[PDB]
Every structure is written in structure tokens, then in C-alpha cells.
Design a binder for this molecule. Structure first.
Ligand SMILES: [Cl-]
Ligand SMILES: [Cl-]
Lengths: 6, 228, 227, 7
């Protein structure tokens, strides 16, 4: 699952 | 450290040069030196700090995942050994960042925005440690991450509006922690959902630019809710 | 050193893993350890050594160019200091490579001899890029001498389509143009190399044809740039 | 500057 970019 | 003899202003200047040159390890070292001068950071400076270390640890995490993938598809000991080498370096960088936050960025942060920013970073870097930790160590790290994130949540709810991008980004990363690390999908979903709804309630009060900022991160929450 | 207790085969294996993870500093250190075992490198291993250090010094060169540009546009001590720091690190890596070449690698077969002498020319050329004084003159002479010895061997012992020979000619012509202030010699070398390779393509398999023509295409690109 | 061998 993606966390806050970057 | 090696930066003790350099002026704070010179360290910040060189951090910005390093960024332009895409020398992120240098950038991180310069910002560590600046932090260790003992003065508070401006908003611009703590974002330089965060960018530098995010790039360094990001490269290490990506390499660790490549090697871990090769290792799991594995007949010698070499893949494990090299994965462990990269792991140890990653752990060193996370320990360095956590050390800066504990000594003494968090306690000296002079406003809510900076306190939340640093506590979120603390949760994030314990989370990166948790990704490569295993046993009782992993359980201690998970509790440490949760406590940092929760303290940040408490402050953000009391001091920031529900559409504030820092508050939204904190909730995003904390919910990722719940799902990916703490094996708590219900808490992940509950947090993302509550955050989404409470932001939506206030969207009509925002300027066009703030509406854009907030709905961007709401869509990141939404992407994860769909995935979960 | 730190790789002394590791098996040669393990160092090679880890170099390949490091390449997959794009960890080129690690890759270079593993290959240096392998060279220090004292056995000759295979063709594959020579390529591992080269791509590792190519990427390390490539990053340093790009950073040096950024900082140099900022410095010349400005002309505190900070920009100069940091450019100097990067420059010193770059020189250290070039000295490491040149040391490996002279102490361990440069000695039988044309393929290896030309490969290493070309490398020696390349890394003296990278030193020349950041040098200035009479120092620069000496470094330029060292690069020229290494390239020239590689050229002499390649013309006697390799066909004109040989990819090592072609890549050598490409870089020596870049040396002439960018370092030695000899654009006419650069253009002549690229042209004769391209033309002599073209005439011999008919001897090659499909796969060898592609290997050779890709480098010929680079020669053509530089010729079109220069003329 | 002029590009050298990229391999
Ligand atoms: Cl290792
Ligand atoms: Cl410096």
C-alpha cells in the first residue's frame, strides 16, 4: 500500500 | 560529527547545492549537521531535512526489496548476506533520523505544525525499521511507531482543521501502518474513512488551491480504501 | 581489505546482485575485491568492473558539472568548497581505477589488453576534465598515450568491426575533440573508423552486425554533431 | 559535451 509521496 | 566545524548557514547553503546536484547523501549529511547546531528549523529547513533522508532511505528500501525478492525465489548464502548488508545500512540511516527527532527536534518544536511534522516522521522511520525487522524487535518497533503516530494524531485533531494537508498526510501514513505493518485492517479502514468524511465536510469552505490540496490527499486515502 | 576474507566467486555473485539493485558503489567495491584475488578477469567480469565504476564516476562527473556551472555563474566560499569536495572524491575514484589497472590488470590477449588500455585512457580523460595547470598537460599526455597504445594493438589484432575496437575509436575521437583541442583529428578518426567498419559488415552474423552497427551509429551521431 | 561510449 502507497504512503504519502515522494 | 564531521560537520561540527561548519557554520549553520553554510551547511544549509550546501544542502541546497547538494539537492541541485542530486547528491542526496551529501544533502542529508549537511542537514544533520545543521540540526545538530541545536537551533529550531524553519518550515523550509525541515522540508530540506525530510527530502534528503526520504531520498536516501527510499533508495535503500528499493534495493532491499529487490534483494529480498531474489532471496525469496531462492541452491548459496550470498543473496541473504548482501540483503543483510543493505538492511544494516538502512537501519543505520533510520536510527540516525530517529536520533535527530529525539535529540531534540520534537521537544523543541515551537508550533503544532512542526510538532506534527516531526512526530509523523518518527512514525514513518520506525515504520521503515518495522519493514525489515523480525521478532520481538519488530514488536517493539511497531509499538514505537504507533505511539508516535498517535501523539501526532492527538495534536492534529486539536490544532489543525480536518482539511489541513499535513493532518491528512499523517492520517494516510498512519492508516498504511495499520494495514501493512500492524496487521490491523479494521483500524486502517476506520481511520482512512473517518479522515475522508471529516475532510469532505469542510471542502465547501476552501479556496480553489486548498480544495485541490485537500482532495488530492483524500484521493490517496480513497485509493487505499478501494485496495483494502 | 574488507573483501579479503570473501571468496572470489561470492564477490562476483554479489557484484551481479548489486547491479540488479542499482547499487553501483557496492558493485565497484565487490569487483575491486575480486580483482585483488590476483586472477585474470573474464570478458563478463571485465564488463562488471567497468559498468560499476562507470556509474560511480558518472554520478560524480554530473554533480561536478552542476556545481562548476553554479560556481562560474557566481564568479561566500561555500560553492567552491563543495565543488572541491566533489572534485576530490571524483579524483579518488579515478585514482582507484587507474591503480587497479596498473597494479593488477594491464599486462596477453588483444581483447583484454585493448579493453584495459581504453579504460586507462578514459579515466585519465575524466581526470583531465577537472584539471587545470601544467598538471592538465601531463594528464592529457597520459590519456593520449594509453589510447594510442590501445589503438595500435586494435588495428593489428582486431577486425575493423570489433566492438571493443569501435568503442575505443569513439572515445579516442571524443578525447581529440573535447580534451586535446584537435577537432580535425577527431573527425578524421571517426570517419575512417566508420567507413572501414562499414566495408566489413558483410562478414558478420545478425547478432554481431547489431553489436557493431550500434556503435557505428554513435560514431555517425558525433560526426553529424561536429560537422 | 560530445557523448562518449554509453555501454
Ligand atoms: Cl555482503
Ligand atoms: Cl564542503
Amino acid at each position: 500500500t502507497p504512503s504519502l509521496p515522494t | 560529527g564531521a560537520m561540527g566545524s561548519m557554520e549553520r548557514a553554510s551547511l544549509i547553503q550546501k544542502a541546497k547545492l547538494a539537492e541541485q546536484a542530486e547528491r542526496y547523501e551529501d544533502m542529508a549529511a549537511f542537514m544533520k549537521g545543521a540540526v545538530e547546531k541545536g537551533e529550531e528549523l524553519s518550515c523550509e529547513e525541515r522540508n530540506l531535512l525530510s527530502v534528503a533522508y526520504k531520498n536516501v532511505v527510499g533508495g535503500q528500501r528499493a534495493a532491499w526489496r529487490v534483494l529480498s525478492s531474489i532471496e525469496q525465489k531462492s541452491e548459496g548464502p550470498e543473496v541473504r548476506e548482501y540483503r543483510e548488508k543493505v538492511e544494516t545500512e538502512l537501519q543505520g540511516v533510520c536510527d540516525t533520523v530517529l536520533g535527530l527527532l529525539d535529540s531534540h527536534l520534537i521537544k523543541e518544536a515551537g508550533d503544532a505544525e512542526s510538532r506534527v511534522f516531526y512526530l509523523k516522521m518518527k512514525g514513518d522511520y520506525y515504520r521503515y525499521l518495522a519493514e525489515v525487522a523480525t521478532g520481538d524487535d519488530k514488536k517493539r518497533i511497531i509499538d514505537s511507531a504507533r505511539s508516535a503516530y498517535q501523539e501526532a494524531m492527538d495534536i492534529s485533531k486539536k490544532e489543525m482543521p480536518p482539511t489541513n494537508p499535513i493532518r491528512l498526510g499523517l492520517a494516510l501514513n498512519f492508516s498504511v501502518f495499520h494495514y501493512e505493518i500492524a496487521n490491523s485492517p479494521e483500524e486502517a479502514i476506520s481511520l482512512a474513512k473517518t479522515t475522508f468524511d471529516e475532510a469532505m465536510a469542510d471542502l465547501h469552505t476552501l479556496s480553489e488551491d486548498s480544495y485541490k490540496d485537500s482532495t488530492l490527499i483524500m484521493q490517496l486515502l480513497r485509493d487505499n480504501l478501494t485496495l483494502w
